[PDB]
Design a binder for this molecule. Structure first.
Ligand code: MG
Ligand code: MG
Ligand code: MG
Ligand code: MG
Lengths: 10, 236, 236, 10
């Protein structure tokens, strides 16, 4: 489970 | 640029076709030519530039982490020497990733940031600048790893000062800025406590401002507040 | 070629790294340089060339069908003229798809097919040749659509004659040949009955040969027999 | 649901 950054990949 | 003979409106139209075709390299090349026409970008046009380059650099970051790992697995005690091939290919992908980063930072510095007077435009570009210095930092190992990291921090901090003064706490660009800057603290700057404190403070201030929002604005902001909540659950 | 200075063994090693990085363009460029060293390919090396180019051409086919559809939606009665942008971009992707096809067919014709003496090598390349003529046919509209289609058919038929005489009915390369050739009948040659008859006959002959197989060979063959079963369920 | 050909994309 990877930490979130924006924007996200398709 | 090779897009110099195509109409700005045609470049924007084709960026959107390319997004639907999941053709991100094309999308990025179109939005590069659009920026290079020299006119400021609209809110929609800023998102197309962001979305285009993040998917390009995202494929290269993923690829780099696969190769970086195979390379380290081949550097332990009891690992069989496979020759230079893993290092050469990791270097080639990394070099290509660095050129994208330098290209995005070139557009930001020539001349998107100096012409961005509004809070929303300026905070968006300064965030972009922090993000792409961060991608350089993920793979930097030598003489100016420290200068690259401080360039990311510095851009991230100017964006945070402007959003703090000029945008509400639920503004998606503010919430995305804070999500990214927190992850910077956590995994680039080795400040996991700074990373966690920024995430709670950002979540809580937005929570207390949701009451002012339309149903549509609510869905936009809550989406991003849930990304902050997920990071915090993972680090605590 | 720009791979002419790299060792064949290094090109194969990096094709496999690129597959794990999901870097298919790199994978394809590596296996191109490998073919261009002029030595016959091994079974494993044939699969890397196949897998590499199918993922490249697969992204372009997907992209082409998205643009082709938006273009036709913009050619109905009651659709607003959006200018030439949709057609120009569809043409550019299609042109790029055609160059990949011509490149793969160039490798097959210089000189992979003439040097393939074994059943397995020859049937694999003749299948590849039918497949990439088929991709050209999917987008062909003019003077030699008919000649392109007959080139696909002809290569598909020589492969089928050799596999019929030289490989058992459960051979994965035979089963994959027949899956692809059936789809050719169905959606390129407008022979849906020929498409369905090939699929049943292929399924049934393989079913009656599974008893001769190891557990591992069984999993390989049954996997592909299920793709034939799925097509048949969809067309009947 | 799309008809199957081999090999398949990643
Ligand atoms: Mg041009
Ligand atoms: Mg503590
Ligand atoms: Mg070379
Ligand atoms: Mg009938």
């Amino acid at each position: 489970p990877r930490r979130n950054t924006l924007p996200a990949m398709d | 640029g090779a897009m110099g003979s195509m109409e700005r409106a045609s470049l924007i139209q084709k960026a959107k076709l390319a997004e639907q075709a999941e053709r991100y390299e094309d999308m990025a090349a179109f939005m590069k030519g659009a920026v290079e026409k020299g006119e400021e970008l609209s809110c929609e046009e800023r998102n197309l530039l962001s979305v285009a380059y993040k998917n390009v650099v995202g494929g290269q970051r993923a690829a780099w982490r696969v190769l970086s790992s195979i390379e380290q697995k081949s550097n332990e005690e009891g690992s069989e020497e496979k020759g230079p091939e893993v290092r050469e290919y990791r270097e080639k992908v990394e070099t290509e990733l660095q050129g994208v980063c330098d290209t995005v930072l070139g557009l930001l510095d020539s001349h998107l940031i100096k012409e961005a007077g509004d809070a929303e435009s300026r905070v968006f570009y300064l965030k972009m600048k922090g993000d792409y210095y961060r991608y350089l930092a993920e793979v930097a190992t030598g003489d100016d790893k420290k200068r690259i990291i401080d360039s990311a921090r510095s851009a991230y901090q100017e964006a945070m000062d402007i959003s703090k003064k000029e945008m509400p706490p639920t503004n998606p660009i503010r919430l995305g800025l804070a999500l990214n800057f927190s992850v910077f603290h956590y995994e680039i700057a080795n400040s996991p406590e700074e990373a966690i404190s920024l995430a709670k403070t950002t979540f809580d201030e937005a929570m207390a401002d949701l009451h002012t929002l339309s149903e549509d604005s609510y869905k936009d902001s809550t989406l991003i507040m849930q990304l902050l909540r997920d990071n915090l659950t993972l680090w605590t």
